[PDB]
DNA sequence: GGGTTGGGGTTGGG
């Protein structure tokens, strides 16, 4: 009954693989993991990926202790610039001598489409990792017990 | 020590509550989507002027004090607070609104926030205000939320107001999540 | 020259706006962007939608939306998902069509209000549009463009982009305002003449009390130093001390004293009150007239006020000359009209700052910055003027007089002494109690309605031999949680009954509501009369007396309950309408915007849930257009629901438990509905339409039974009937009399105006007073029985004309105010009866002649007031009109432009777009010459205009005559070329012009148009 | 929005239509032939169908739907209803913007359905024509509800908390008593 | 601790 759920790269991978393997579901873009959802919360390091001949779409990468996911970054059309939250990451990366950092990212995924990443914030505290893990486990338990 | 409740718990208790009931809660959440369609501020006197007599040419005169008063601007903001569970609309008053304004921009002084907003609006500089409000999006905090089951215009309604806003720190929130999950596993 | 056209295109109008740089339809935009190709095929409906849809943008963005070969266009998301993405991208911006009725929360959008325009957004046409376009381009097209879709013959509905209403949007001192309106309608009376006991004059019985009661003026910011405040306080103390020594009784007896037979009138009133039996009608009328002939004169009241002021206010407070100036202007203020008021500048601009002696300056700015010193002292002089007036003059007039206006005297003001008004109030109460009002007790009225509905107030206007009660419902009860008055409560039912009014027009009776309906009915009857062959005509005129009070509550309730034209449930929709104004399109100084061409109006509508033909659910509006010019509509997100049961409860409450107050005495109606409620007219029309359709069965079949042309209209309680059969007229009179006898109502004065004479004995009409006239007069309109032409009725004297004119002039917007006022005065009534289907060319000329002759006398006081101010002291006007004849140049420019605009509008109304431009120009020149000749003839005798201005006006008139003659001469050569084929209307115009011999001069047409 | 639906007064229309159905059934089955009364008393089949008149249309927000059992949930303000619809054709006729859920719809017409089951009578409400007007994604938390798919047990539930629900339940029970008295 | 939308303007018929 909630459209936003927190999960990590491995959960993304298994959900996508299961949806592709078994497409006999409802004719709607919503995924199915103890319900329908469109938003996800994940904390992992981000790194730019250099695409070719692909100006409108910017390809990302989120490697984590469980796996890696590919996301697409969209930019404005009337003028060619970057969203402020990603310009902040770019300037931080150039300032800190090209060192990647973990980020707290919120991203939207739909089946038969790429995974769009809307916003993220750079995290500098390590306790956020444990916070995200515990929140993930608690939310999964809540969803499982609310299904029944 | 304090006890923290979730947005869904607050919603269920507010619904089950009878008219005229109040209760306070402390929630880990993030502010989002500040609304500015309605009037952003109102005028009050220093002596708590209940009625402010409007005149022309920026003239003001309180009734609770009966002196020629310089108008005092009080900032009124509407936004939405939301945890991982649910989202609700909240009322933000002058003190908290000024606190967030000074936090996002240290240049503007605490009580100077309302005057700064009024000056920008009257001069016709709304892009700056919009960008400042947008910079506050997904700002994690610790919220003290109170709900009131009150009747307005012979219509029942529930109103949510934020009382305290504190800087967030992950340690005790993670501890609370850990004990909650351990309790759930034990049960 | 530029002419107004009855048919216009939205794209053509939009291309005339400088702000918008790119305007095109959707199909051509798609072709330019190469999203589609001509060789491609589409459904006919989709093609028509693409062609009709109109888009616009502030800049040229064709290149930005150019087709890209990098990636094809295939759609997998839903239209709702695309719209949500666009709304999220919009962010904090809060003025767009698509955001109406919805809110954004993070990356989630929420819908909470009803928006009738969302159907077009989510339609299959927009689905196919998105399929063609693509998600990334659609999300930005919904923002970068203004989308208009045709939904009617000429109507368009905006569905995306910035809302059009956004285009229709260091301080200086503003002086206070004289509260002149407080004088009117004061019914309070006190044992000792003077002022109210609440005033500071009476509250005092030291400087402490006066300071406490006058802090609002004592602690003003205009005072330079504490010494000024102390001096003002001393002056107030002296004023208060002087006030208590005034013999008000002696002053009243000297200046405005009661009539000699006042004791006799009081005795007569007491006898009438105490008499048990009904009083004599003629005696009561004579008493009313005698009481009303005791009014006080303007000069008498001015002398009274001057005597009061002189011995109460020290002469040094304002200065020797300023005091005299104020006293002189006091008379002008006294004689000032009801909806008119004075200004502080009217006194400030004529007194001298330096006359005041007690003024002190902290800094020696008297010689350094004289202008700054003058402004600073003016700020205090105005405060002193306002204080004096609003604290002495207004309270005295309020306490010691009742001030109001008569019934047929227009806006003219009259004064009456308080005891006379007390006697009048007692007599009026006695009259009303016997007929329709009863004293009421709060015990009877149920507490539910008592706390749910506010009560009304009663006001009485003097009349010749009688009165005219008026009840108002403005008040709202602070207690019992009431925040609205009766009209605000009932405006929902008002909307419902306004919807009912549409089918009330023609279905179940003969009811009319506006000059458009009257004109179309007249045109149809005129056409039928022409078809018949111009036979003789007869008319009858009669009206109902006190229609509102003669309404049966039970019958009205039964009609409401059994009427099927009112549905069970209705929904309320709010929307904004943009409509073309009366301004011709400029042909291509650079700042051209929507308000230059469109007028914004707020509209509400109530619609039923049936699958009605008008299908309001699809559009959200229901508008009637008299032209082909386009209009734009945008919906809103504030819907409401109303049920027939609520209307039933409201009707029952207003019929039964209507409570009004007077002199702190409560009253309750006994019969009928109260006048002044927003639904009273519609309810009365419906109620009487029921009875008239009951009793007018024969008229339904008469026009084919024997082929007799007959016309019947009823406006509220007034009846007009024109027919060809005297038998039909007599039958109608008999049937109406029978209906009145059966339903318990009667007609006013037992008087009837006819075009014939008949024996009243046969039809038991002896009590009627038949008046025979050869010219019908209805609702202020004059109708001919020979040519069947209609023109309005105008007054004949300047004294009559001035009684209905309120003059308000502000220096800030002189040009705009005068232009709009003159425009409204000319277009007030002429536009509604300038239909060429009714009058001929001569009739139109005569109508314009008489209307202009009335309007010039109407507008004369405006330039008389204007000449009281010299514009050479204002830079804004001096830089534009010089310094020698600024007033004359300003007036000439205003008159010239107003006349030109009026002539253009008149030509547009008279002729269609197919008529020749030469004919249009000739007629415009003729009308302009007529107007200018009337104005010149009127103004050639006035002394103020006797010099410089008259030569300019004569030059303008001569130029117009010359242009008309030249156009008439050239038209012959133009038509001789055989290049044009003339229609019947053009031939008629040519015959008219040739018959009147406009080639040489105008002396032939003047006797025909000036006949009275 | 809640006020707009509360002003509809759905209870009035429901009571009037129930009274009309009861009266029509009473007058149309005055034959009182014993063998006919016996033979139309059979398990799980409809016996009468009364279509509502044009005056009693109302609008509600769809909260949930179930295609397998043809169960549709309606709500407005404080009260939510669970009714059935004729078939999928009703859904296809209603040009839904995105989804049946969270969409504001107007009921063009509906009909009361009477059924005999488990030695008693159950009254069913079937929606016949549907029309969507605009999408309302606002969750209304209805404290109170009545069920038309469970009969007297599904209607008399939670009656003590609403006066209108109490009156409608009393009318329903009286209608059931009259029907059983006439038929048996 | 807040809260329809308060005005501005005044002509011609009823
Ligand atoms: Zn104060």
Which residue's alpha carbon is at the shortest distance from the C1' of E1? Answer: B93
Chain-centroid distance of CA C506 in Å reads 27
- For residues D18 and D146, the answer to whether their CB atoms sit within 8 Å is no
Rg of the Cα trace of chain B? 19
Which residues, at least 6 apart from C928, have a Cβ–Cβ distance to it below 8 Å?
C899, C900, C903, C960, C964
- For residues C777 and C541, the answer to whether their CB atoms sit within 8 Å is yes
Chain-centroid distance of CA C691 in Å reads 32
- For residues C118 and C84, the answer to whether their CB atoms sit within 8 Å is no
Kindly state the DSSP code that residue D161 receives in the 8-state scheme: G
How many residues does this entry show for chain B?
187
- CA C738 – CA C744 distance, rounded (Å): 10
- CA D46 – CA D29 distance, rounded (Å): 15
β-pairing verdict for C146-150 and A72-74? unpaired
Backbone angles phi, psi at B125, to 5 degrees: -110, 85
Q: Which tokens is D147 given?
A: 């069920």
- For residues C399 and C201, the answer to whether their CB atoms sit within 8 Å is no
**C166-174 own/partner pairs: CB under 8 Å, 24+ apart:** C166/C95, C167/C19, C167/C593, C167/C594, C167/C595, C168/C594, C168/C595, C168/C600, C171/B57, C171/B58, C173/B57, C173/C379, C174/B56, C174/B57
- CA C660 – CA C473 distance, rounded (Å): 9
- For residues C805 and C858, the answer to whether their CB atoms sit within 8 Å is yes
**Interatomic CA–C1' length for residue C639 and nucleotide E3, angstroms:** 19
**Centroid of ligand 1 to alpha carbon of B49 (angstroms):** 5
Scanning every residue of chain A, which has its alpha carbon at the shortest distance from the alpha carbon of C138?
A77
- Measuring CA to CA, which residue among C980, C1005, C1007, C985 is closest to residue C995? C1005
Query: Does an H or E element contain C263, and which?
Result: helix C262-274
Q: Which tokens is A116 given?
A: 């769009």
- Measuring CA to CA, which residue among C929, C1000, C922 is closest to residue C1? C922
| 3-class SS string, C748-795 | HHHEEEECCCCCCCCCCCCCCEEEECCCEEECCEEECCCCCCEEECCC
DSSP C490-503: HHHHHHHHHHHHHH
CA max distance for chain D = 54
How far the first Cα of chain D sits from its last, in Å, is 46
Q: Which residues of C64-86 are buried (b: 16+ CB within 10 A; e: fewer)?
A: ebeeeeeeeeeeebbbbebbbbb
**Cβ count within 10 A of residue C386:** 18
- For residues C714 and C695, the answer to whether their CB atoms sit within 8 Å is no
- Measuring CA to CA, which residue among C623, C620, C615 is closest to residue C634? C620
Residue C160: exposed, middle, or buried by beta-carbon count in 10 A (0-12, 13-18, 19+)?
buried
Alpha helices in D63-160 (DSSP H): 88-93, 152-156
**Cβ count within 10 A of residue C284:** 18
* Break positions in chain C: residue before each gap, C to N over 2.5 angstroms: 169, 205, 588
Q: Which tokens is C85 given?
A: 């993405």
- For residues C311 and C242, the answer to whether their CB atoms sit within 8 Å is yes
β-pairing verdict for B41-44 and C718-723? unpaired
- CA D146 – CA D168 distance, rounded (Å): 10
**Centroid of ligand 1 to alpha carbon of C509 (angstroms):** 62
**Cβ count within 10 A of residue C330:** 18
Chain-centroid distance of CA C58 in Å reads 36
- For residues C638 and C116, the answer to whether their CB atoms sit within 8 Å is no
Q: Which tokens is C660 given?
A: 């009004």
- CA C447 – CA C602 distance, rounded (Å): 37
Which residues, at least 6 apart from B52, have a Cβ–Cβ distance to it below 8 Å?
B43, B44, B45, B60, B62, B63, B71
DSSP C539-585: EEEEEBSSTGGG--HHHHHHHHHH-TTS-SEEEEEEEEEEEE-S-PP
Which residues, at least 6 apart from C128, have a Cβ–Cβ distance to it below 8 Å?
C46
- CA C252 – CA C419 distance, rounded (Å): 13
**Centroid of ligand 1 to alpha carbon of B102 (angstroms):** 27
Q: Which residues of C219-244 are buried (b: 16+ CB within 10 A; e: fewer)?
A: ebebbbeeebbebbbebbbebbeebe
- CA D101 – CA D136 distance, rounded (Å): 9
For tokens 């059994």, the residue is C562
Strand partners, B149: B158
How far the first Cα of chain B sits from its last, in Å, is 24
Residue D134: exposed, middle, or buried by beta-carbon count in 10 A (0-12, 13-18, 19+)?
buried
Query: What is the three-class DSSP state of C704?
Result: helix
Q: Which of residues 6-65 of A touch B (CB under 8 A)?
A: 6, 41
Query: Does an H or E element contain C136, and which?
Result: helix C135-144
- For residues C458 and C185, the answer to whether their CB atoms sit within 8 Å is no
- For residues C310 and C328, the answer to whether their CB atoms sit within 8 Å is no
**Interatomic CA–C1' length for residue C829 and nucleotide E12, angstroms:** 8
Cα angle for residues C525, C529, C535 (degrees, 5° grid): 140
Backbone angles phi, psi at C927, to 5 degrees: -65, -45
Q: Which tokens is C333 given?
A: 């203020």
For tokens 């005295």, the residue is C396
Residue C1012: exposed, middle, or buried by beta-carbon count in 10 A (0-12, 13-18, 19+)?
exposed
Q: Angle, to 10 degrees, between the axis of helix C886-910 and the axis of helix C841-866?
A: 160
CB contact under 8 A, B177 and A135: yes
Which residue's alpha carbon is at the shortest distance from the C1' of E10? Answer: C339
Which residues, at least 6 apart from C461, have a Cβ–Cβ distance to it below 8 Å?
C404, C405, C406, C407, C467, C468, C469, C470
- CA C925 – CA C340 distance, rounded (Å): 37
Scanning every residue of chain D, which has its alpha carbon at the shortest distance from the alpha carbon of B155?
D3
- CA C416 – CA C319 distance, rounded (Å): 33
Query: What is the three-class DSSP state of B57?
Result: coil
Compute, in degrees rounded to 10, the torsion defined by CA atoms C779, C780, C785, C787: -120
Strand partners, C458: C471
From chain B, the residues in CB contact with A130 under 8 A are: 174
β-pairing verdict for C631-635 and C155-160? parallel
- Measuring CA to CA, which residue among D89, D95, D92, D88 is closest to residue D66? D88
- For residues C754 and C733, the answer to whether their CB atoms sit within 8 Å is no
- CA C577 – CA C599 distance, rounded (Å): 8
- CA D177 – CA D184 distance, rounded (Å): 10
Shortest Cα–Cα distance, C643 to chain D (Å)? 7
- For residues C782 and C773, the answer to whether their CB atoms sit within 8 Å is no
- CA C92 – CA C104 distance, rounded (Å): 9
- For residues C540 and C752, the answer to whether their CB atoms sit within 8 Å is yes
Scanning every residue of chain C, which has its alpha carbon at the shortest distance from the alpha carbon of A108?
C107
Query: What is the three-class DSSP state of C946?
Result: coil
Question: Is any Cβ of chain A less than 8 angstroms from the Cβ of C70?
Answer: yes
- CA C384 – CA C388 distance, rounded (Å): 6
Q: Which tokens is C466 given?
A: 């009688």
Ramachandran category for residue C112: left, alpha or beta (phi over 0 → left; psi -120 to 50 → alpha) = alpha
- CA C310 – CA C302 distance, rounded (Å): 12
- CA C345 – CA C336 distance, rounded (Å): 16
Q: Which tokens is C118 given?
A: 């969302």
- For residues C686 and C453, the answer to whether their CB atoms sit within 8 Å is no
Strand partners, B88: B81
Cα angle for residues B158, B161, B166 (degrees, 5° grid): 150
- Measuring CA to CA, which residue among C414, C189, C420, C400 is closest to residue C287? C420
- CA B139 – CA B29 distance, rounded (Å): 8
Compute, in degrees rounded to 10, the torsion defined by CA atoms C806, C807, C812, C815: 100
Shortest Cα–Cα distance, C81 to chain A (Å)? 10
Q: Which residues of C980-1011 are buried (b: 16+ CB within 10 A; e: fewer)?
A: eeeeeebeebbebbeebebeeebeebeeebee
Strand partners, C710: C723
- CA C538 – CA C786 distance, rounded (Å): 10
Query: What is the three-class DSSP state of C251?
Result: helix
- For residues C495 and C674, the answer to whether their CB atoms sit within 8 Å is no
Dihedral of alpha carbons C865, C869, C872, C876, sign: negative
**B66-72 own/partner pairs: CB under 8 Å, 24+ apart:** B66/C215, B67/C219, B68/C219, B68/C220, B68/C221, B69/B45, B71/B43, B72/B43, B72/B44, B72/B45, B72/B46
Cβ–Cβ pairs < 8 A, chains A and C: 28
- CA A9 – CA B155 distance, rounded (Å): 48
How is the beta sheet containing C659-662 ordered, strand by strand?
C437-439, C665-669, C659-662, C456-463, C466-472
- Measuring CA to CA, which residue among A121, A84, A115 is closest to residue A102? A121
For tokens 């109040």, the residue is B22
Which residues, at least 6 apart from C215, have a Cβ–Cβ distance to it below 8 Å?
B66
Residue C664: exposed, middle, or buried by beta-carbon count in 10 A (0-12, 13-18, 19+)?
exposed
CB contact under 8 A, A3 and C76: no
- For residues C236 and C210, the answer to whether their CB atoms sit within 8 Å is yes
- Measuring CA to CA, which residue among D165, B32, D132 is closest to residue C617? D132
Which residues, at least 6 apart from C832, have a Cβ–Cβ distance to it below 8 Å?
C515, C516, C519
- CA C584 – CA C188 distance, rounded (Å): 55
Q: Which tokens is C112 given?
A: 């909470």
Strand partners, D52: none
Rg of the Cα trace of chain C? 34
CB contact under 8 A, D143 and B15: yes
Q: Nearest by CB to B56, which of C103, C106, C174?
A: C174
Q: In Å, how far are B62, C841, C906, C919, C984 from C987, measured between CA atoms? A: 75, 13, 20, 11, 5
Chain E footprint bases within 7 A of protein beta carbons: 1-4, 9-14
Using the CA of B162, give the nucleotide whose C1' is nearest: E1
- CA D63 – CA C250 distance, rounded (Å): 82
Q: Which tokens is D142 given?
A: 């209805």
Query: Does an H or E element contain A49, and which?
Result: strand A39-49
Using the CA of B78, give the nucleotide whose C1' is nearest: E2
- For residues C637 and C115, the answer to whether their CB atoms sit within 8 Å is yes
- For residues C529 and C766, the answer to whether their CB atoms sit within 8 Å is no
- For residues B178 and A131, the answer to whether their CB atoms sit within 8 Å is no
Q: In Å, how far are B126, B156, D6, D165 from B18, measured between CA atoms? A: 41, 10, 20, 20
Scanning every residue of chain B, which has its alpha carbon at the shortest distance from the alpha carbon of A84?
B135
- For residues C383 and C217, the answer to whether their CB atoms sit within 8 Å is yes
């Amino acid at each position: 009954p909630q459209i936003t759920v927190p999960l990590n790269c491995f959960m993304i991978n298994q959900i996508v693989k299961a949806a592709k393997e078994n497409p006999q579901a409802h004719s709607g873009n919503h995924y199915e993991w103890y319900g329908a959802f469109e938003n996800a919360i994940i904390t992992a390091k981000f790194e730019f990926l250099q695409s070719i001949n692909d100006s409108p779409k910017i390809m990302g990468k989120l490697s984590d202790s469980t796996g890696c996911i590919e996301v697409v970054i969209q930019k404005s059309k009337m003028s060619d610039e970057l969203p402020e939250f990603v310009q902040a990451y770019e300037i931080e990366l150039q300032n800190n001598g090209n060192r990647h950092k973990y980020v707290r990212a919120m991203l939207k995924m739909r089946k038969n489409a790429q995974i769009q990443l809307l916003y993220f914030s750079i995290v500098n505290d390590a306790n956020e990792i444990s916070r995200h893990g515990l929140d993930l486990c608690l939310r999964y338990l809540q969803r499982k017990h609310g299904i029944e | 020590q304090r006890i923290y409740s979730s947005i869904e718990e607050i919603i269920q208790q507010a619904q089950a509550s009878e008219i005229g009931q109040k209760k306070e809660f402390y929630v880990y959440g993030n502010l989002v989507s500040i609304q500015m369609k309605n009037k952003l501020y109102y005028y009050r006197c220093t002596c708590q002027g209940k009625s402010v007599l409007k005149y022309h040419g920026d003239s003001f005169f309180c009734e609770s004090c009966q002196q020629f008063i310089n108008p005092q601007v009080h900032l009124m903001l509407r936004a939405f607070v939301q945890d991982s569970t649910g989202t609700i609309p909240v009322m933000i008053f002058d003190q908290q609104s000024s606190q967030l304004i000074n936090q996002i921009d240290p240049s503007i002084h605490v009580q100077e926030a309302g005057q700064y907003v009024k000056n920008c609006i009257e001069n016709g500089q709304e892009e700056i205000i919009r960008q400042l409000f947008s910079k506050l999006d997904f700002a994690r905090f610790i919220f003290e939320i109170q709900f009131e089951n009150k009747e307005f215009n012979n219509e029942q309604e529930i109103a949510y107001k934020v009382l305290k806003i504190e800087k967030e720190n992950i340690k005790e929130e993670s501890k609370y999540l850990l004990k909650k999950l351990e309790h759930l596993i034990n049960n | 020259k530029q002419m107004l056209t009855r048919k216009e295109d939205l794209l053509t109008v939009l291309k005339q706006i400088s702000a918008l740089k790119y305007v095109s339809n959707l199909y051509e935009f798609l072709l330019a962007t190469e999203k589609i190709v001509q060789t491609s095929e589409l459904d006919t409906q989709f093609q028509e939608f693409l062609t009709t849809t109109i888009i616009a943008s502030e800049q040229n963005l064709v290149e930005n939306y150019k087709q890209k070969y990098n990636q094809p266009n295939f759609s997998q998301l839903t239209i709702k998902q695309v719209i949500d993405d666009s709304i999220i991208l919009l962010g904090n911006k809060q003025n767009y069509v698509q955001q109406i009725g919805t809110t954004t929360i993070g990356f989630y959008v929420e819908y909470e209000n009803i928006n009738l325009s969302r159907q077009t957004l989510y339609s299959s046409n927009f689905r196919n549009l998105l399929n063609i376009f693509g998600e990334e381009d659609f999300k930005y097209f919904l923002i970068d463009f203004l989308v208009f879709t045709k939904v009617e013959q000429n109507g368009y509905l905006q569905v995306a982009g910035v809302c059009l209403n956004q285009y229709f949007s260091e301080n200086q001192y503003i002086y206070p305002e004289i509260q002149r309106s407080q004088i009117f309608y004061c019914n309070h009376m006190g044992r000792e003449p003077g002022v109210f006991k609440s005033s500071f004059f009476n509250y005092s019985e030291p400087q402490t009390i006066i300071k406490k009661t006058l802090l609002k003026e004592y602690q003003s910011k205009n005072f330079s130093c504490q010494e000024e405040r102390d001096l003002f306080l001393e002056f107030t103390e002296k004023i208060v001390q002087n006030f208590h020594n005034i013999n008000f009784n002696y002053l009243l007896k000297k200046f405005c004293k009661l009539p000699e037979n006042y004791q006799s009138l009081k005795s007569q009133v007491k006898q009438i009150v105490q008499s048990e039996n009904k009083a004599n009608q003629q005696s009561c009328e004579n008493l009313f007239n005698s009481l009303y002939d005791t009014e006080i004169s303007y000069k008498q009241i001015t002398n009274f006020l001057r005597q009061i002021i002189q011995n109460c206010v020290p002469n040094q407070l304002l200065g020797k000359k300023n005091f005299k100036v104020f006293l002189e202007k006091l008379y002008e203020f006294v004689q000032m009209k009801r909806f008119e008021n004075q200004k502080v500048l009217d006194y400030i601009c004529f007194m001298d700052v330096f006359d005041v002696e007690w003024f002190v300056d902290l800094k020696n700015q008297k010689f350094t910055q004289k202008r700054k010193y003058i402004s600073d002292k003016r700020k205090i002089l105005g405060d002193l003027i306002v204080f004096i007036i609003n604290k002495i003059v207004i309270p005295v007039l309020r306490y010691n007089f009742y001030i109001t206006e008569k019934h047929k005297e227009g806006s003219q003001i009259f004064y009456y002494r308080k005891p006379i008004w007390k006697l009048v109030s007692k007599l009026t109460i006695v009259k009303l109690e016997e007929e329709n009002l009863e004293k009421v007790e709060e015990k009877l009225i149920p507490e539910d309605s008592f706390q749910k509905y506010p009560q009304g107030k009663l006001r009485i206007i003097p009349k010749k031999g009688s009165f005219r009660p008026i009840m108002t419902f403005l008040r709202k009860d602070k207690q019992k949680n009431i925040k609205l008055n009766l009209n605000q409560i009932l405006m929902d039912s008002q909307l419902v009954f306004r919807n009912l009014k549409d089918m009330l027009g023609q279905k179940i009776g003969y009811s009319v509501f506006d000059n458009k309906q009257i004109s179309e009915k007249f045109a149809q009857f005129i056409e039928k009369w022409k078809n018949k062959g111009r036979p003789q005509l007869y008319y009858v005129t009669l009206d109902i007396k006190k229609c509102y009070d003669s309404i049966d509550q039970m019958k009205l309730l039964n009609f409401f309950n059994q009427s099927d034209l009112i549905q069970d449930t209705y929904f309320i929709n709010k929307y904004l309408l943009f409509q073309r104004n009366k301004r011709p399109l400029l042909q291509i100084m650079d700042n051209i915007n929507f308000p230059y061409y469109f007028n914004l109006k707020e509209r509400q509508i109530a619609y039923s849930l049936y699958d009605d033909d008008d299908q309001i659910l699809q559009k959200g509006f229901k508008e009637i257009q008299s032209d082909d010019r386009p209009f734009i509509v945008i919906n809103q997100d504030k819907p409401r629901c109303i049920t027939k049961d609520i209307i039933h409860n409201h009707l029952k409450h207003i019929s039964q438990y209507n409570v009004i107050s007077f002199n702190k005495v409560k009253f309750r109606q006994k019969r009928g509905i109260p006048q002044g409620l927003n639904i009273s007219g519609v309810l009365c029309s419906f109620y009487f339409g029921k009875l008239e359709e009951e009793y007018t069965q024969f008229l339904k079949n008469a026009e084919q039974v024997n082929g007799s042309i007959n016309l019947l209209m009823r406006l509220t309680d007034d009846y007009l009937f024109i027919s060809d059969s005297q038998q039909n007229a007599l039958n109608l009179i008999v049937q109406l009399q029978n209906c009145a006898n059966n339903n318990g109502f009667m007609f006013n004065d037992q008087k009837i105006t006819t075009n014939f004479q008949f024996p009243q004995e046969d039809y038991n009409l002896e009590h009627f007073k038949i008046s025979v006239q050869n010219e019908c007069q209805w609702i202020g309109k004059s109708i001919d029985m020979n040519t069947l032409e209609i023109k309005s009725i105008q007054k004949q004297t300047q004294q009559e004309i001035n009684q209905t004119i309120n003059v308000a002039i502000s220096i800030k917007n002189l040009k705009s105010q005068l232009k709009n006022k003159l425009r409204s005065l000319f277009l007030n009534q002429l536009i509604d009866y300038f239909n060429p289907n009714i009058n001929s060319f001569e009739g139109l000329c005569r109508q314009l002649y008489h209307h202009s002759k009335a309007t010039v006398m109407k507008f004369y006081p405006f330039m008389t007031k204007l000449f009281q101010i010299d514009l050479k002291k204002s830079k804004q006007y001096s830089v534009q009109y010089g310094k020698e004849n600024t007033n004359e140049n300003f007036l000439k420019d205003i008159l010239y432009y107003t006349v030109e605009d009026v002539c253009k509008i008149l030509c547009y109304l008279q002729f269609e777009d197919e008529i020749n431009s030469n004919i249009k120009e000739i007629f415009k020149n003729l009308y302009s010459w007529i107007m200018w000749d009337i104005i010149v003839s009127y103004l050639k005798k006035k002394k103020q205009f006797k010099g410089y201005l008259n030569k300019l006006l004569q030059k303008i008139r001569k130029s117009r005559f010359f242009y008309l003659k030249e156009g008439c001469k050239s038209l012959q050569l133009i038509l001789s070329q055989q290049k044009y084929q003339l229609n019947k209307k053009e031939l008629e115009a040519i015959e008219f012009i040739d018959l009147n011999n406009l080639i040489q001069d105008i002396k032939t047409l003047i006797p025909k148009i000036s006949a009275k | 929005m809640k006020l707009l639906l509360q002003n509809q007064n759905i209870f009035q229309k429901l009571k009037n239509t129930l009274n009309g159905c009861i009266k029509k059934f009473y007058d149309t089955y005055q034959d009182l032939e014993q063998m006919q009364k016996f033979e139309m008393i059979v398990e799980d089949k409809l016996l009468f169908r009364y279509s509502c008149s044009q005056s009693e249309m109302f609008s509600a927000q769809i909260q949930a739907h179930y295609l397998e059992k043809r169960v549709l949930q309606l709500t407005d303000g404080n009260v939510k209803y669970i009714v059935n619809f004729r078939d999928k054709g009703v859904l296809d006729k209603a040009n839904f913007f995105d989804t049946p859920n969270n969409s504001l719809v107007i009921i063009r017409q509906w009909s009361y359905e009477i059924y005999y089951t488990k030695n008693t009578f159950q009254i069913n409400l079937v929606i016949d024509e549907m029309r969507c007007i605009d999408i309302i994604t606002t969750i209304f938390y209805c404290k109170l509800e009545l069920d038309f798919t469970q009969g007297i047990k599904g209607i008399s539930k939670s009656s003590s908390f609403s006066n209108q629900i109490y009156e409608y339940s009393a009318q329903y029970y009286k209608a059931i008593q009259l029907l059983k008295k006439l038929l048996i």
